[PDB]
Amino acid sequence: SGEWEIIDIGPFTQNLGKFAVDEENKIGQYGRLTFNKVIRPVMKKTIYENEREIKGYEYQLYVYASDKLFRADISEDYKTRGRKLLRFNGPVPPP
């Protein structure tokens, strides 16, 4: 199951946005991008399994990179804390 909250922007969200841009630059579809900012709202999904136990998270962010707005989804595994870029699409309209 997934449960949801909005988290505020600050260094943690800035670094999620920078992670997303670095990961997208590995793929190369949009050429080389450079991070500009994360804007509100930042969604945090917590993924539960079994007896309402956290398996991991997904952060869904609007990120300006190279002056274009993208939607990035980043997974984070609870056990390992490992993060991955799941989706990076755009450009997209501002929220």
Numbering used by the authors: 0 to 94
What does the paper say about this structure?
The yield of the C41V mutant was the highest among all the mutants, while the yields of C41A, C41L, and C41S were comparable to that of the WT, indicating no significant differences in expression levels among the SCM mutants. Furthermore, under all three different pH conditions the relative order of the Tm values of the SCM mutants was the same; that is, C41A > C41V > WT > C41S > C41L. The SCM C41A and C41V mutants were crystallized under slightly different conditions, resulting in having different space groups (i.e., P1 for C41A, and P21 for C41V). The crystals of both mutants contained two protein molecules that formed a dimer in the asymmetric unit. Models for all 94 residues were successfully constructed for the C41V mutant, while the models for the loop between the β2 and β3 strands (i.e., residues Glu48–Arg51) in the C41A mutant could not be constructed due to poor electron densities. The overall structures of SCM C41A and C41V were almost identical to that of the WT. A comparison of crystal structures revealed that the conformers of the side chains of Thr12 and Leu60 differed among the C41A, WT, and C41V variants. The crystal structures of SCM mutants indicated that the side chains of Ala41 and Val41 are in close proximity to hydrophobic residues, as was the case for Cys41.
Single-chain monellin (SCM) is an engineered protein that links the two chains of monellin, a naturally sweet-tasting protein. This protein is an attractive candidate for use as a sugar replacement in food and beverages and has numerous other applications. In this study, we focused on the Cys41 residue of SCM, which is a single cysteine residue present at a structurally important position. However, this substitution may destabilize SCM because Cys41 is buried in the hydrophobic core of the protein.
